[PDB]
Amino acid sequence: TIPHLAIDPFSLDFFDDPYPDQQTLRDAGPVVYLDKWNVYGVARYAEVHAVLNDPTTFCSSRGVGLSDFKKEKPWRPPSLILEADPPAHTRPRAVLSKVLSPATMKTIRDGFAAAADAKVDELLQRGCIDAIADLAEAYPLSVFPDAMGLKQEGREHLLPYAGLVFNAFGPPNELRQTAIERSAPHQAYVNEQCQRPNLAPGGFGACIHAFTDTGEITPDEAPLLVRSLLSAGLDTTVNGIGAAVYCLARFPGELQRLRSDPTLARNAFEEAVRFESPVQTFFRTTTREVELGGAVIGEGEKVLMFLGSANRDPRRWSDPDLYDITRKTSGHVGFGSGVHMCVGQLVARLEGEVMLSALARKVAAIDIDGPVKRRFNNTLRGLESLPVKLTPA
Numbered sequence: 478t479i480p481h482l483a484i485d486p487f488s489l490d491f492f493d494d495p496y497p498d499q500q501t502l503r504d505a506g507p508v509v510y511l512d513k514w515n516v517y518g519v520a521r522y523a524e525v526h527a528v529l530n531d532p533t534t535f536c537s538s539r540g541v542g543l544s545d546f547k548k549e550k551p552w553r554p555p556s557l558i559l560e561a562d563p564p565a566h567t568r569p570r571a572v573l574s575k576v577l578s579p580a581t582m583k584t585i586r587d588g589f590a591a592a593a594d595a596k597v598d599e600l601l602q603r604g605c606i607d608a609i610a611d612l613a614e615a616y617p618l619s620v621f622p623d624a625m626g627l628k629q630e631g632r633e634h635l636l637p638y639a640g641l642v643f644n645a646f647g648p649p650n651e652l653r654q655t656a657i658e659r660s661a662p663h664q665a666y667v668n669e670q671c672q673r674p675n676l677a678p679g680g681f682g683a684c685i686h687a688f689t690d691t692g693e694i695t696p697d698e699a700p701l702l703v704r705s706l707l708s709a710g711l712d713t714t715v716n717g718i719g720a721a722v723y724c725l726a727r728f729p730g731e732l733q734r735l736r737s738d739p740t741l742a743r744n745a746f747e748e749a750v751r752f753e754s755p756v757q758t759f760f761r762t763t764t765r766e767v768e769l770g771g772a773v774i775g776e777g778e779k780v781l782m783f784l785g786s787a788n789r790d791p792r793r794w795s796d797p798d799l800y801d802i803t804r805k806t807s808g809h810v811g812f813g814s815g816v817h818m819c820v821g822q823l824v825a826r827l828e829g830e831v832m833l834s835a836l837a838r839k840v841a842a843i844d845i846d847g848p849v850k851r852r853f854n855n856t857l858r859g860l861e862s863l864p865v866k867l868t869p870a
Protein backbone atom coordinates (compact mmCIF):
# COMPACT_ATOMS: atom_id res chain seq x y z
CA THR A 478 0.00 0.00 0.00
CA ILE A 479 1.01 3.61 -0.68
CA PRO A 480 1.21 6.14 2.17
CA HIS A 481 -0.71 9.37 1.69
CA LEU A 482 0.93 12.65 2.64
CA ALA A 483 -0.43 16.19 2.71
CA ILE A 484 2.95 17.89 2.13
CA ASP A 485 2.67 20.48 -0.64
CA PRO A 486 6.04 20.39 -2.50
CA PHE A 487 4.99 23.58 -4.33
CA SER A 488 4.29 25.72 -1.23
CA LEU A 489 6.42 28.62 -0.05
CA ASP A 490 6.92 26.88 3.31
CA PHE A 491 8.35 23.90 1.41
CA PHE A 492 10.55 26.08 -0.81
CA ASP A 493 11.83 27.90 2.27
CA ASP A 494 13.21 24.72 3.84
CA PRO A 495 12.63 21.56 1.83
CA TYR A 496 15.02 19.13 3.53
CA PRO A 497 12.92 18.02 6.55
CA ASP A 498 9.91 17.37 4.32
CA GLN A 499 12.16 15.56 1.83
CA GLN A 500 13.35 13.21 4.56
CA THR A 501 9.72 12.68 5.59
CA LEU A 502 9.00 11.87 1.92
CA ARG A 503 11.95 9.47 1.59
CA ASP A 504 11.32 7.68 4.87
CA ALA A 505 7.58 7.26 4.27
CA GLY A 506 8.32 4.69 1.57
CA PRO A 507 9.70 4.23 -1.94
CA VAL A 508 6.41 5.56 -3.38
CA VAL A 509 4.08 8.10 -1.75
CA TYR A 510 0.81 9.66 -2.85
CA LEU A 511 0.57 13.46 -2.52
CA ASP A 512 -3.10 14.14 -1.75
CA LYS A 513 -2.67 17.89 -2.26
CA TRP A 514 -2.26 17.46 -6.04
CA ASN A 515 -3.30 13.81 -6.65
CA VAL A 516 0.12 12.67 -7.91
CA TYR A 517 2.53 9.92 -6.97
CA GLY A 518 5.90 10.91 -5.56
CA VAL A 519 9.32 9.28 -5.43
CA ALA A 520 12.00 10.96 -3.33
CA ARG A 521 14.69 8.28 -2.91
CA TYR A 522 17.67 7.98 -5.23
CA ALA A 523 16.95 4.42 -6.37
CA GLU A 524 13.36 5.11 -7.47
CA VAL A 525 14.11 8.51 -9.04
CA HIS A 526 16.93 6.88 -11.02
CA ALA A 527 14.65 4.03 -12.08
CA VAL A 528 11.87 6.33 -13.29
CA LEU A 529 14.31 8.50 -15.27
CA ASN A 530 15.81 5.45 -16.97
CA ASP A 531 12.45 3.93 -18.02
CA PRO A 532 11.08 6.36 -20.65
CA THR A 533 8.68 3.80 -22.15
CA THR A 534 6.78 3.40 -18.90
CA PHE A 535 7.27 6.94 -17.52
CA CYS A 536 6.86 9.07 -20.63
CA SER A 537 7.53 12.79 -21.16
CA SER A 538 5.16 13.37 -24.11
CA ARG A 539 2.20 13.94 -21.78
CA GLY A 540 4.21 16.80 -20.18
CA VAL A 541 6.83 16.93 -17.44
CA GLY A 542 4.80 19.36 -15.35
CA LEU A 543 1.65 18.63 -13.38
CA SER A 544 -0.63 19.18 -16.37
CA ASP A 545 -1.37 16.07 -18.47
CA PHE A 546 -1.25 17.07 -22.15
CA LYS A 547 -3.76 14.31 -22.90
CA LYS A 548 -6.22 16.18 -20.61
CA GLU A 549 -5.30 19.88 -20.83
CA LYS A 550 -3.84 22.04 -23.55
CA PRO A 551 -0.15 22.93 -23.02
CA TRP A 552 0.40 26.61 -22.30
CA ARG A 553 2.79 26.78 -25.31
CA PRO A 554 3.50 24.36 -28.16
CA PRO A 555 5.24 21.33 -26.63
CA SER A 556 8.99 21.18 -26.67
CA LEU A 557 10.19 18.87 -29.45
CA ILE A 558 12.88 17.48 -27.15
CA LEU A 559 11.84 17.79 -23.47
CA GLU A 560 8.18 16.86 -24.03
CA ALA A 561 8.79 14.09 -26.57
CA ASP A 562 9.43 10.37 -26.28
CA PRO A 563 11.63 8.15 -28.44
CA PRO A 564 11.64 7.78 -31.33
CA ALA A 565 10.27 11.30 -31.95
CA HIS A 566 12.79 12.57 -29.38
CA THR A 567 15.88 10.92 -30.87
CA ARG A 568 16.78 13.04 -33.89
CA PRO A 569 16.16 16.51 -32.35
CA ARG A 570 18.21 15.27 -29.38
CA ALA A 571 20.98 14.26 -31.79
CA VAL A 572 21.01 17.74 -33.33
CA LEU A 573 21.23 19.60 -30.01
CA SER A 574 23.91 17.10 -28.98
CA LYS A 575 26.02 18.07 -32.00
CA VAL A 576 25.28 21.80 -31.57
CA LEU A 577 26.34 21.62 -27.88
CA SER A 578 29.20 19.27 -28.55
CA PRO A 579 32.81 19.02 -27.35
CA ALA A 580 33.97 20.74 -30.54
CA THR A 581 31.59 23.60 -29.86
CA MET A 582 32.95 23.91 -26.32
CA LYS A 583 36.46 24.15 -27.75
CA THR A 584 35.43 27.17 -29.83
CA ILE A 585 33.88 29.10 -26.90
CA ARG A 586 36.03 28.07 -23.91
CA ASP A 587 38.64 30.86 -24.20
CA GLY A 588 36.01 33.59 -24.44
CA PHE A 589 33.89 32.17 -21.63
CA ALA A 590 36.96 32.04 -19.37
CA ALA A 591 38.16 35.54 -20.31
CA ALA A 592 34.68 36.85 -19.44
CA ALA A 593 34.72 35.08 -16.07
CA ASP A 594 38.13 36.48 -15.08
CA ALA A 595 37.15 40.00 -16.15
CA LYS A 596 33.95 39.79 -14.09
CA VAL A 597 35.66 38.61 -10.91
CA ASP A 598 38.29 41.33 -11.37
CA GLU A 599 35.52 43.91 -11.74
CA LEU A 600 33.65 42.56 -8.71
CA LEU A 601 36.86 42.65 -6.64
CA GLN A 602 37.03 46.38 -7.39
CA ARG A 603 33.61 46.75 -5.75
CA GLY A 604 34.36 44.52 -2.76
CA CYS A 605 30.72 44.36 -1.58
CA ILE A 606 28.39 42.87 -4.20
CA ASP A 607 25.23 40.86 -4.73
CA ALA A 608 26.46 37.44 -5.83
CA ILE A 609 23.15 36.86 -7.63
CA ALA A 610 22.56 40.06 -9.61
CA ASP A 611 26.23 40.95 -10.03
CA LEU A 612 27.71 37.48 -10.64
CA ALA A 613 25.29 34.55 -10.87
CA GLU A 614 23.09 36.48 -13.32
CA ALA A 615 25.58 38.92 -14.86
CA TYR A 616 28.16 36.37 -15.97
CA PRO A 617 25.83 33.96 -17.85
CA LEU A 618 24.09 37.04 -19.26
CA SER A 619 27.47 38.25 -20.54
CA VAL A 620 28.26 35.01 -22.43
CA PHE A 621 25.13 32.96 -23.17
CA PRO A 622 23.01 35.44 -25.22
CA ASP A 623 26.05 36.18 -27.38
CA ALA A 624 26.89 32.49 -27.72
CA MET A 625 23.27 31.96 -28.87
CA GLY A 626 23.73 34.73 -31.42
CA LEU A 627 20.91 36.85 -30.04
CA LYS A 628 20.69 40.49 -30.93
CA GLN A 629 21.31 43.00 -28.15
CA GLU A 630 17.85 44.52 -27.82
CA GLY A 631 15.23 42.75 -25.72
CA ARG A 632 17.49 40.49 -23.65
CA GLU A 633 15.70 41.72 -20.49
CA HIS A 634 12.98 39.22 -21.48
CA LEU A 635 15.30 36.18 -21.18
CA LEU A 636 15.22 35.65 -17.43
CA PRO A 637 11.47 36.44 -17.06
CA TYR A 638 10.67 33.92 -19.82
CA ALA A 639 12.78 31.22 -18.15
CA GLY A 640 11.11 31.76 -14.77
CA LEU A 641 7.74 31.49 -16.49
CA VAL A 642 8.77 28.20 -18.14
CA PHE A 643 9.85 26.60 -14.86
CA ASN A 644 6.90 28.03 -12.93
CA ALA A 645 4.58 26.51 -15.58
CA PHE A 646 5.79 22.99 -14.80
CA GLY A 647 4.12 23.47 -11.42
CA PRO A 648 0.51 23.08 -10.33
CA PRO A 649 -2.01 25.88 -10.99
CA ASN A 650 -1.02 27.80 -7.85
CA GLU A 651 -0.44 31.53 -7.56
CA LEU A 652 3.16 31.20 -8.79
CA ARG A 653 2.02 29.55 -12.00
CA GLN A 654 -1.03 31.63 -12.86
CA THR A 655 0.78 34.89 -12.09
CA ALA A 656 3.63 33.98 -14.43
CA ILE A 657 1.33 32.92 -17.27
CA GLU A 658 -0.79 36.06 -16.90
CA ARG A 659 2.25 38.29 -17.53
CA SER A 660 3.75 36.06 -20.23
CA ALA A 661 2.66 37.67 -23.52
CA PRO A 662 5.61 40.08 -24.04
CA HIS A 663 8.29 37.53 -23.15
CA GLN A 664 6.70 34.85 -25.33
CA ALA A 665 6.60 37.32 -28.24
CA TYR A 666 10.27 38.25 -27.85
CA VAL A 667 11.56 34.68 -27.53
CA ASN A 668 9.51 33.35 -30.44
CA GLU A 669 10.75 36.16 -32.71
CA GLN A 670 14.44 35.56 -31.89
CA CYS A 671 13.94 31.87 -32.73
CA GLN A 672 13.58 32.71 -36.43
CA ARG A 673 16.72 32.19 -38.55
CA PRO A 674 16.99 35.84 -39.81
CA ASN A 675 17.43 37.02 -36.22
CA LEU A 676 20.28 34.70 -35.17
CA ALA A 677 23.89 35.75 -35.72
CA PRO A 678 26.03 33.47 -37.91
CA GLY A 679 28.29 31.24 -35.82
CA GLY A 680 25.96 31.05 -32.81
CA PHE A 681 24.10 28.10 -31.35
CA GLY A 682 20.84 29.31 -32.89
CA ALA A 683 22.17 29.60 -36.44
CA CYS A 684 23.84 26.22 -35.94
CA ILE A 685 20.48 24.61 -35.15
CA HIS A 686 18.98 26.13 -38.31
CA ALA A 687 22.00 24.96 -40.30
CA PHE A 688 21.21 21.36 -39.23
CA THR A 689 17.83 21.38 -40.96
CA ASP A 690 19.00 19.61 -44.17
CA THR A 691 20.57 16.41 -42.83
CA GLY A 692 17.24 14.63 -42.51
CA GLU A 693 17.36 14.84 -38.72
CA ILE A 694 15.11 17.91 -38.33
CA THR A 695 13.06 20.01 -40.76
CA PRO A 696 13.18 23.81 -41.06
CA ASP A 697 9.83 24.17 -39.28
CA GLU A 698 11.34 22.35 -36.25
CA ALA A 699 14.39 24.59 -35.78
CA PRO A 700 12.67 27.60 -34.07
CA LEU A 701 11.28 25.32 -31.34
CA LEU A 702 14.74 23.82 -30.73
CA VAL A 703 16.17 27.34 -30.46
CA ARG A 704 13.29 27.97 -28.04
CA SER A 705 14.47 24.99 -25.97
CA LEU A 706 17.95 26.51 -25.48
CA LEU A 707 16.44 29.89 -24.59
CA SER A 708 14.09 28.21 -22.11
CA ALA A 709 16.59 25.94 -20.41
CA GLY A 710 19.99 27.50 -21.02
CA LEU A 711 20.19 30.58 -18.81
CA ASP A 712 18.24 30.53 -15.54
CA THR A 713 19.47 27.01 -14.71
CA THR A 714 23.12 28.09 -14.95
CA VAL A 715 22.28 31.28 -13.03
CA ASN A 716 20.94 29.19 -10.17
CA GLY A 717 23.82 26.75 -10.52
CA ILE A 718 26.51 29.41 -10.22
CA GLY A 719 24.57 31.02 -7.37
CA ALA A 720 24.44 27.66 -5.59
CA ALA A 721 28.21 27.28 -5.99
CA VAL A 722 28.99 30.75 -4.60
CA TYR A 723 26.49 30.21 -1.79
CA CYS A 724 28.24 26.93 -0.98
CA LEU A 725 31.71 28.49 -1.01
CA ALA A 726 30.41 31.15 1.39
CA ARG A 727 28.89 28.64 3.82
CA PHE A 728 31.83 26.16 3.71
CA PRO A 729 34.98 28.31 3.89
CA GLY A 730 37.17 25.24 4.32
CA GLU A 731 36.07 24.15 0.87
CA LEU A 732 36.87 27.56 -0.64
CA GLN A 733 40.33 27.15 0.87
CA ARG A 734 40.77 23.70 -0.70
CA LEU A 735 39.61 25.12 -4.04
CA ARG A 736 42.11 27.98 -3.76
CA SER A 737 44.93 25.49 -3.18
CA ASP A 738 43.98 23.43 -6.26
CA PRO A 739 42.00 25.41 -8.84
CA THR A 740 41.76 22.30 -11.00
CA LEU A 741 39.00 21.29 -8.54
CA ALA A 742 36.76 23.97 -10.08
CA ARG A 743 34.84 21.64 -12.39
CA ASN A 744 34.06 19.18 -9.60
CA ALA A 745 33.38 22.01 -7.15
CA PHE A 746 30.65 23.15 -9.52
CA GLU A 747 29.36 19.60 -10.04
CA GLU A 748 29.10 19.10 -6.29
CA ALA A 749 27.16 22.38 -6.05
CA VAL A 750 24.71 21.07 -8.66
CA ARG A 751 24.19 17.98 -6.50
CA PHE A 752 24.04 19.88 -3.19
CA GLU A 753 21.50 22.52 -4.23
CA SER A 754 20.01 20.94 -7.38
CA PRO A 755 18.81 23.99 -9.34
CA VAL A 756 16.08 21.87 -10.94
CA GLN A 757 14.33 20.43 -7.91
CA THR A 758 11.44 18.43 -9.38
CA PHE A 759 10.19 17.09 -12.71
CA PHE A 760 7.19 14.92 -13.61
CA ARG A 761 6.59 11.85 -15.72
CA THR A 762 3.29 10.24 -16.76
CA THR A 763 2.77 6.48 -16.61
CA THR A 764 1.84 4.90 -19.95
CA ARG A 765 0.63 1.68 -18.29
CA GLU A 766 0.15 -0.03 -14.95
CA VAL A 767 3.59 -0.58 -13.43
CA GLU A 768 5.29 -1.97 -10.33
CA LEU A 769 7.73 0.51 -8.80
CA GLY A 770 9.49 -0.26 -5.52
CA GLY A 771 6.89 -2.85 -4.58
CA ALA A 772 4.14 -0.41 -5.57
CA VAL A 773 1.57 -0.58 -8.38
CA ILE A 774 0.74 2.69 -10.13
CA GLY A 775 -2.10 2.90 -12.63
CA GLU A 776 -1.94 4.07 -16.24
CA GLY A 777 -2.20 7.78 -16.96
CA GLU A 778 -0.89 8.86 -13.54
CA LYS A 779 1.54 11.71 -12.91
CA VAL A 780 4.72 10.85 -10.99
CA LEU A 781 6.63 13.63 -9.23
CA MET A 782 10.38 12.94 -9.02
CA PHE A 783 12.30 14.80 -6.28
CA LEU A 784 15.73 15.31 -7.89
CA GLY A 785 17.14 17.40 -5.04
CA SER A 786 16.01 14.75 -2.55
CA ALA A 787 17.53 11.87 -4.55
CA ASN A 788 20.76 13.93 -4.46
CA ARG A 789 20.61 14.09 -0.65
CA ASP A 790 19.43 10.51 -0.03
CA PRO A 791 21.64 8.94 2.69
CA ARG A 792 20.83 5.55 1.13
CA ARG A 793 23.06 6.63 -1.77
CA TRP A 794 25.41 9.33 -0.46
CA SER A 795 27.79 9.47 2.46
CA ASP A 796 27.27 12.69 4.45
CA PRO A 797 24.80 13.97 1.83
CA ASP A 798 24.32 17.33 3.59
CA LEU A 799 28.03 18.22 3.38
CA TYR A 800 29.37 20.19 0.44
CA ASP A 801 32.58 18.33 -0.50
CA ILE A 802 34.43 19.43 -3.65
CA THR A 803 36.36 16.15 -3.86
CA ARG A 804 33.22 14.00 -3.66
CA LYS A 805 32.70 11.33 -6.30
CA THR A 806 29.58 12.98 -7.76
CA SER A 807 29.09 10.59 -10.69
CA GLY A 808 25.51 9.38 -10.63
CA HIS A 809 23.88 12.53 -9.24
CA VAL A 810 20.59 13.40 -10.94
CA GLY A 811 20.91 17.21 -10.95
CA PHE A 812 21.17 17.02 -14.75
CA GLY A 813 18.70 14.13 -14.96
CA SER A 814 19.52 10.62 -16.18
CA GLY A 815 18.86 8.59 -19.31
CA VAL A 816 17.74 9.67 -22.76
CA HIS A 817 16.76 13.19 -21.60
CA MET A 818 19.83 13.85 -19.46
CA CYS A 819 20.62 17.55 -19.83
CA VAL A 820 21.84 18.03 -23.40
CA GLY A 821 23.38 21.38 -22.46
CA GLN A 822 25.38 20.03 -19.52
CA LEU A 823 28.67 20.77 -21.30
CA VAL A 824 27.74 24.45 -21.50
CA ALA A 825 26.62 24.49 -17.87
CA ARG A 826 29.81 22.82 -16.66
CA LEU A 827 31.97 25.12 -18.82
CA GLU A 828 30.36 28.26 -17.35
CA GLY A 829 30.56 26.96 -13.80
CA GLU A 830 34.11 25.65 -14.14
CA VAL A 831 35.58 28.87 -15.53
CA MET A 832 33.73 30.95 -12.93
CA LEU A 833 34.90 28.84 -10.00
CA SER A 834 38.39 28.79 -11.54
CA ALA A 835 38.46 32.59 -11.56
CA LEU A 836 37.29 32.76 -7.94
CA ALA A 837 39.90 30.14 -6.97
CA ARG A 838 42.70 32.23 -8.44
CA LYS A 839 41.59 35.74 -7.46
CA VAL A 840 39.54 35.56 -4.24
CA ALA A 841 40.79 34.93 -0.70
CA ALA A 842 37.43 34.84 1.11
CA ILE A 843 33.70 35.19 0.53
CA ASP A 844 31.70 36.51 3.49
CA ILE A 845 27.94 36.99 3.65
CA ASP A 846 27.36 40.58 4.78
CA GLY A 847 23.63 41.13 4.36
CA PRO A 848 20.23 39.41 4.38
CA VAL A 849 20.00 36.37 2.12
CA LYS A 850 16.76 36.34 0.09
CA ARG A 851 15.35 33.20 -1.52
CA ARG A 852 13.79 33.28 -4.99
CA PHE A 853 10.61 31.17 -5.17
CA ASN A 854 9.78 29.09 -8.24
CA ASN A 855 7.72 25.95 -8.70
CA THR A 856 10.64 24.01 -10.23
CA LEU A 857 13.87 26.00 -9.68
CA ARG A 858 15.76 26.41 -6.40
CA GLY A 859 17.97 29.44 -6.00
CA LEU A 860 18.53 32.75 -4.31
CA GLU A 861 17.13 36.18 -5.08
CA SER A 862 19.94 38.13 -3.39
CA LEU A 863 23.25 36.95 -1.88
CA PRO A 864 25.09 39.94 -0.36
CA VAL A 865 28.77 39.07 -0.12
CA LYS A 866 32.10 40.75 0.50
CA LEU A 867 34.93 39.47 -1.72
CA THR A 868 38.43 39.69 -0.23
CA PRO A 869 41.12 39.88 -2.93
CA ALA A 870 43.76 37.15 -2.86
Ligand code: HEM
Pocket residue numbers: 537541558559560570573577705706709710711713714717750754755756759810811812813814816817818819820821822824825
Ligand atom coordinates in the same frame (compact mmCIF):
# COMPACT_ATOMS: atom_id res chain seq x y z
C1 HEM B 1 23.38 23.83 -13.90
C2 HEM B 1 22.68 23.98 -15.04
C3 HEM B 1 21.58 23.01 -15.54
C4 HEM B 1 20.80 22.14 -14.87
C5 HEM B 1 20.75 21.86 -13.35
C6 HEM B 1 19.94 21.47 -15.84
C7 HEM B 1 19.00 20.51 -15.55
C8 HEM B 1 18.37 19.70 -16.47
C9 HEM B 1 17.63 18.48 -16.19
C10 HEM B 1 17.39 17.86 -14.79
C11 HEM B 1 17.18 17.99 -17.36
C12 HEM B 1 16.35 16.70 -17.54
C13 HEM B 1 14.88 17.03 -17.85
C14 HEM B 1 14.04 15.77 -17.84
O1 HEM B 1 14.58 14.67 -17.58
O2 HEM B 1 12.80 15.87 -18.07
C15 HEM B 1 17.62 18.87 -18.42
C16 HEM B 1 17.35 18.73 -19.77
C17 HEM B 1 17.64 19.68 -20.74
N1 HEM B 1 18.48 20.77 -20.56
FE1 HEM B 1 19.43 21.30 -18.87
N2 HEM B 1 20.23 21.97 -17.09
C18 HEM B 1 21.23 22.91 -16.96
C19 HEM B 1 21.81 23.61 -18.00
C20 HEM B 1 21.38 23.62 -19.32
C21 HEM B 1 21.96 24.40 -20.41
C22 HEM B 1 23.15 25.35 -20.21
C23 HEM B 1 21.26 24.15 -21.54
C24 HEM B 1 21.44 24.71 -22.98
C25 HEM B 1 22.44 25.50 -23.38
C26 HEM B 1 20.22 23.19 -21.19
C27 HEM B 1 19.25 22.64 -22.02
C28 HEM B 1 18.52 21.50 -21.74
C29 HEM B 1 17.64 20.84 -22.68
C30 HEM B 1 17.40 21.35 -24.11
C31 HEM B 1 17.11 19.76 -22.09
C32 HEM B 1 16.14 18.76 -22.76
C33 HEM B 1 16.95 17.47 -22.91
C34 HEM B 1 16.12 16.29 -23.37
O3 HEM B 1 14.90 16.24 -23.09
O4 HEM B 1 16.71 15.39 -24.03
N3 HEM B 1 20.34 22.90 -19.84
N4 HEM B 1 18.34 19.92 -17.84
Ligand SMILES: C=Cc1ccc(C(=O)O)cc1
Pocket residue numbers: 556557558559560642704705706708709756
Ligand atom coordinates in the same frame (compact mmCIF):
# COMPACT_ATOMS: atom_id res chain seq x y z
C1 LIG C 1 15.39 21.25 -17.64
C2 LIG C 1 14.63 22.26 -18.00
C3 LIG C 1 14.12 22.43 -19.44
C4 LIG C 1 13.23 23.44 -19.71
C5 LIG C 1 12.75 23.63 -21.00
C6 LIG C 1 13.18 22.80 -22.03
C7 LIG C 1 12.65 23.04 -23.44
O1 LIG C 1 12.01 24.10 -23.69
O2 LIG C 1 12.85 22.18 -24.34
C8 LIG C 1 14.09 21.79 -21.76
C9 LIG C 1 14.56 21.60 -20.46
Ligand SMILES: [Cl-]
Pocket residue numbers: 553664667668
Ligand atom coordinates in the same frame (compact mmCIF):
# COMPACT_ATOMS: atom_id res chain seq x y z
CL1 LIG D 1 6.69 30.53 -25.92
